[PDB]
Amino acid sequence: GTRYAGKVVVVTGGGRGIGAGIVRAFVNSGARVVICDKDESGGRALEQELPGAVFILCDVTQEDDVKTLVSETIRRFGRLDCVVNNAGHHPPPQRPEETSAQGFRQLLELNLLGTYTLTKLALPYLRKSQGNVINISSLVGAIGQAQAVPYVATKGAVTAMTKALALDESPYGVRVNCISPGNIWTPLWEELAALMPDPRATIREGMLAQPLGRMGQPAEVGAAAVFLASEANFCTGIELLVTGGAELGYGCKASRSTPVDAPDIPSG
């Protein structure tokens, strides 16, 4: 209700999906929230619906959009307390031979270097407020994922970069943490499934990947982000898993293209 009252928070990719759930969660905690998104439609709708949230058109891959975002946030609101690096993209499934260096580079621009660029420009102001940084990584950065070599690499980089930043910024009292969601039901998840030959079978497999038996919601990642910013004052460099237990226990991992012998020869 007031656990982050009056703090200024920038959320990239805040126009829909997990980012919108983060935006709403910080607004509910009393923060001034600057929505950064390359897409005007969702951000403008959130800005008009939510007082306390304002929208600034900004592509995190463009160094000058991020410089203007930072310049305007300070110019209009006087401080910066929290940066949530959520803007990111997951390509459709691609085998390694179906990936290109050019595509990998483009994905690093958004998923990693957008996060790096905003953080670097935000730090001189976060140091002044003893603010904090929250990166939205992914569970697959930690455990891998099939048909997603470029995406998995960008998220492995984000999680590692979070720890290096935590070390670099701890002398100023600036905490740097990441959230690693598993399967969260979002427009991105829906758009990816709709590319499959059986979208709802894909969605059901995504639900069965969790011991809890469902996907997560954006509001649940949002609650984790407000916790990290407002009540985790002894946490830095941590990776907070919001995954429904997907990393626990044994499961069916041999793919449908993987030769598997009958169970009379169990170990080759």
Added chain:
Amino acid sequence: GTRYAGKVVVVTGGGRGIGAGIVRAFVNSGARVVICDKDESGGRALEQELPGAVFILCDVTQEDDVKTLVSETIRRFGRLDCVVNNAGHHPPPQRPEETSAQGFRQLLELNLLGTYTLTKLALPYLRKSQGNVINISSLVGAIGQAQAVPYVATKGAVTAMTKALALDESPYGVRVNCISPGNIWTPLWEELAALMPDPRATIREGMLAQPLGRMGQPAEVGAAAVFLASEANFCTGIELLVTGGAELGYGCKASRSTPVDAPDIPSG
């Protein structure tokens, strides 16, 4: 303020230290808190100071004290929503040749089997409320600690048991999570340091073990416990680090009894 309002919460070892900070944090969230402690003095003081907290004398190593704790909590309050297994002990430093099987067993009774016994008796009621279990483990369960083989083993067991329980209880919607604190300034920490030849040098070394440059507070573990119980509905089987970054980066690890060559032979 009301994020866990009316839920019934049992906290073992709640009379002082981290447990008291957990008790206060749940009371602040609106819960009915049953303080379990073998020591009457601290629990009675908390119970008299805090309405909403009641004290029940209980040694978690005694199966009948735990059975009576559970029987009385239901008998008096009608439900059980959350169990926080915090009761635990850290022995003074002991080299491996200075440990005994008898001492190891006694430590397993408190640190592991007390946690197991209460959880087992609580589950039939937690299943009915879709409640959750929170175990207080330790960072050293994950990274080890010098001169603490028995203690480190009990906490490794608690963290692993948390994940097995999460898998066993997810079909009922019961979440099971643990918090792994690093260095938290508590009466236990103070009593251990006071056994050293230079207690404040020991305390200062405990502060320098964190990039943040201080130890944590019980209230910070308490905020993490209320988060897990009340707002982490997609988290199960996680290990939430409350460590001030102590696990990050390189540090001075070669002990004062460890032969180290001069830097003209860096790799042997």
Added chain:
Amino acid sequence: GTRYAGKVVVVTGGGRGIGAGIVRAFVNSGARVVICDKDESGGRALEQELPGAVFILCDVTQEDDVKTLVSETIRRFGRLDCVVNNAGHHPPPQRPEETSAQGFRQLLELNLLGTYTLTKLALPYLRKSQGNVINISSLVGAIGQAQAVPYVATKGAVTAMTKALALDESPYGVRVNCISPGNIWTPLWEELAALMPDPRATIREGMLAQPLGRMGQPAEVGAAAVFLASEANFCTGIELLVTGGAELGYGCKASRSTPVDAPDIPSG
């Protein structure tokens, strides 16, 4: 062929399964191997087949069998270079309400305290040879397993205790490491499956739990143990996964008793 030539190695539970594969692997490397097992049949067969391997009847839960094992190994062979703590048991599936404290204690005696007791008595001799300790833990110590709360706890304890020992013993140059196998086709695995209503379906599910699409073999854990003892001179406190990738990627984790909604409500 000679990578561990003349070193003296004790292997508990070496009469069959993973332990026998470890015994054979060290014999192949040139070691004198002392087979410790409570079962005479398998150890005597290995001792008669393999010169270099000798069998000593020994139950690791009995402090005096372990004291006599150690006393006889030195008395007969003059040194001790390596201890492989492999003796362990996995109970049939048991829900948490189907476990007892008495059964948990008995399992801690074998899986944890047997490992502790031998290590403690072996260390004064390992310190003299700059030898090393290898503990056989389990992947489920790290990621959990359904219907195995006591077993998972003992293996979490072993992995953690390995790191504490590594810290305590590094000033003597004694390395302490563990191997965490996933699904290894052994007599134990076969006996557990044979208790299921469809044993070969269970075995097939055990094979499909790995991206590689099969279970491991004892010889593969054996090759990992000889590596740790003979060529990993900069490794201590590590957990070497021999799992076929079972911990990677998403899989089917929602159990057959877990209510799962249809895919039109993916996140509750």
Added chain:
Amino acid sequence: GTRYAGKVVVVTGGGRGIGAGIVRAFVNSGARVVICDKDESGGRALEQELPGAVFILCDVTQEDDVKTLVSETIRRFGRLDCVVNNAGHHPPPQRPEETSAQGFRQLLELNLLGTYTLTKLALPYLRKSQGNVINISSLVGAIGQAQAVPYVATKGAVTAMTKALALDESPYGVRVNCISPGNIWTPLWEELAALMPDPRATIREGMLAQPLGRMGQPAEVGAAAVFLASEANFCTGIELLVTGGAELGYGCKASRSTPVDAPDIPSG
């Protein structure tokens, strides 16, 4: 001696340091080793000294040097069994405000995309031999490092990409693993220390970061690489730590620029 006899192995950055130790280790195991390095001097010396090792001038950041490397390896030797992606660079210490996007990109080209490019072109031939990939990551990819945000990110990416590749390639039986060294005494380590105001104090701090009390040697990473290629047939997607225990236990983590209170206020 013959544990990898006749297999063809490509090692990038094999002209000195860890790569040279990997080259020598595979040559000792009987392999045909193709040394890839941008620097002619070290590779030519290894090629002339070691029969079985041949040198091919190749910059892994240049797609056509890697295409020619692959084309020539097959053209000259008929098969490809193992790729060791070792070529990498660690910049001098740099605070985050002292880094540039342009420098970050250049470092991603070498440390990540060089590894990606060679792997992609090698896979059609590794699939035919059921070969394997070994990536040389770094412990700091897992735990972070001060003043190295770009470097730490590239190594986090490599470790994650290793797991995604392991999942993508397991249906062909191709294993993909990484080694994460800690402090290894190499020419790179020496050149970085020589940039410090007190190089040998820096080297000594690098030695004290390990419980073992020394840095590792290239030959020790080399032994780990031959193990992964030749005897770890049930290992895929693993991260093999060669760190001397640097990740274990508590150490001095508060930096010399970090305000730390006196020990009479231990937790703020």
